[PDB]
Amino acid sequence: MWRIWLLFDPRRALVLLFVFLFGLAIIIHFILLSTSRFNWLDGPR
């Protein structure tokens, strides 16, 4: 599996991975915040 780095530049791969991860995290957070059961700030209603 260590050969993937012979296929992709580690710098570009790492930057793209971090950007993808942050985007996914913030999107999941906002989806949870949009609901009513899992809204942790003002609560359910």
Partner: protein
């Protein structure tokens, strides 16, 4: 690639680590105070 010597990289890493850790400590104290002001994470029926 970056253009940094190995010693420069190690020194930068040490200073970066200590700065990050102090920032984390300050943030944790801020969060303790913020929870003391108003807790989040309500119950399923509200606050």
């Amino acid at each position: 690639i970056s253009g940094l010597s190995e010693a420069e990289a190690k020194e930068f890493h040490s200073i970066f680590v200590t700065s990050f850790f102090l920032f984390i400590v300050v943030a944790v104290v801020a969060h303790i105070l913020a929870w003391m002001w108003r807790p989040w994470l309500p119950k399923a029926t509200g606050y």
